Design a protein around this nucleic acid. Sequence first.
RNA 1: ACUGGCAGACUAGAGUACUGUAGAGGGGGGUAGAAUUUCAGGUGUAGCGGUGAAAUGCGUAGAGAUCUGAAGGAAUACCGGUGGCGAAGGCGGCCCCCUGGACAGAUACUGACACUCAGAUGCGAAAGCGUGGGGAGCAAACAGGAUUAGAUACCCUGGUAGUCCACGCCGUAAACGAUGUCUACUUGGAGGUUGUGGCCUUGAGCCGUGGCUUUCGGAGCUAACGCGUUAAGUAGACCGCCU
Lengths: 63, 55, 129, 105, 88
Amino acid sequence: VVKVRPFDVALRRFKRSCEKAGILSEVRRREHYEKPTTVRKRAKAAAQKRHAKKLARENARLY
Amino acid sequence: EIDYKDVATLKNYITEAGKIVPSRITGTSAKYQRQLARAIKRSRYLALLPYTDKH
Amino acid sequence: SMQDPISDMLTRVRNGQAANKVAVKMPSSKLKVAIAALLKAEGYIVDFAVEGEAKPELEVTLKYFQAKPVIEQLKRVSRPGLRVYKKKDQLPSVMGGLGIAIVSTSKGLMSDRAARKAGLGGEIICYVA
Amino acid sequence: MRHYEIVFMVHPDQSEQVAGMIERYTGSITEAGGKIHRLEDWGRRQLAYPINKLHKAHYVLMNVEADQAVIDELETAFRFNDAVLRNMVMRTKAAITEQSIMLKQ
Amino acid sequence: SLNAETKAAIVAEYAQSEGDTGSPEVQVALLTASINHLQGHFKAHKGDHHSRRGLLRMVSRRRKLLDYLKGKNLARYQDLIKRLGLRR
RNA sequence: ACUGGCAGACUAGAGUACUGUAGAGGGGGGUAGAAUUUCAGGUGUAGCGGUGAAAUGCGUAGAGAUCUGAAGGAAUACCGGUGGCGAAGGCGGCCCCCUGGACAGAUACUGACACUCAGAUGCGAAAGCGUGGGGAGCAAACAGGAUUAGAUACCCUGGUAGUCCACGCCGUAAACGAUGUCUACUUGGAGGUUGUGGCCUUGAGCCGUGGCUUUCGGAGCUAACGCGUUAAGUAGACCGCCU
């Protein structure tokens, strides 16, 4: 929700007011049924990648 | 010490859409976050908070 | 459950020596202390000590020589699940006689050498090498 | 006995009857060995969403001690009273005799 | 389930000494009381399979304690059985 | 001496009492909000829907869109988490009722009451089966439309059993950590979570002490990959199993 208080701002403010309610995110989640197993598999690989990043990104000479 | 009646506090932990805010954002302790979420959800049932911005 | 205190003693010693621990403590018992006495006599430990009256603890001081642990092998033989008794003529030699086998004879707990000299057999506790 | 916190929200039109309700409801409790610790008529308030197309309702908070038989009685009463729109009964650990955020305001 | 007053009634009744909580007699009597109380629950809640696993641990433990005591003092064992109504 | 027996003794194992704590543990009942579908009415007017494109389909008998209401069923966005709980399977809105386990602190108690378990018994995802209900959405089968050489498929439009409830049955899954249970011992680093004590809470904190859990690694182990105090290390008890 954005009360137009110029329009160009208001539509950008709108576009960021709906990012933040994860609206488009949510529609794309609920377009097709994610089977619960697949949901978890994604979530593990997410966590696993996130860690395996940070770990080696603390191990982060080059030249 | 979270009450389903303390709307004012609870409102610091809901978004404009009405959504419960992550504990990552707010910085709440897991234990507190759990108790918020419970209170917020009791508030919502007493129409002291809204479930959704739409309604 | 812990159903073999002796094996636990040996494990504690073996793991202590492996971790280069100076000494190892364990709940004491007669047979543990008897074993510790023989191991001292044979030069495999430095010393032992039994502290406590209520719940007595045993402290084997471990022995190193050239910064290797003196005990190479500490194999339990007569387990609870399979006891091992040998007659005097059938006593195990360990590391070609250079290790001991702790026999329990009816005249106490001794090395296989001393048991053979005594013409006693008994229960084989362990091999120390 | 167990301590409860009961909030029941009365239909705005029937706001007059509320004080009557408080009396009769606590009547049942007080009667059956039941303490009433706190009683805080919050008055009419704007519902955060429409309930039965209504936009306001008369909130009443009541902390009691009672055996469950007494509260089984109440929940059924609240059910059949067509003025009581919602009611949340919550078991609490300990009696509360303070004043609530709501009334402090 | 057994609260504190009901426990204490039992713990006082079957105590083999002063502030005995731990005799077979006390333990078995409490378990018997728990088991008997819980029989109402599972009449009303046959599907409660998870709670029943906890009921059956009490049943098991009772036996073990009863087998202990019979092994110790058969006369004590015979008393306890009779006082509780167990056909062990 | 050691194992056993017998008669005692002991409190470290195991258990009990007390008080707390966290928790999608289980069972029962109720209820809330969002959304979908159908339906009724209002507005409105030629599309809608679908796809790679399209067609089937729907729509002038008024669809789709939009507003309002109704009725149903199912599932509970956010919170939400390499968070939590449970023997495992598994468990997610909120409220109540019934109920299991774990954990911590403190004191007292019992006195080896233990561990493992052939056979046995019980629990056991989803599908399936029986009976009776229920049936929004989804969808084996099936129908039609496409694609293709063909298309008994993938894609699209539909769609039944099933999915949901009650009470049974079935007994199986990559039921997985592809890792039996129990016990003890053996360098560390960084986290999460749930207790507890102390300090000056001198200021959200810091330091101890428990439970559970995640990750990285040392020795060691391993064919290697890797495992690494939650072992796949060092040992013990017992079971299952391989050839």
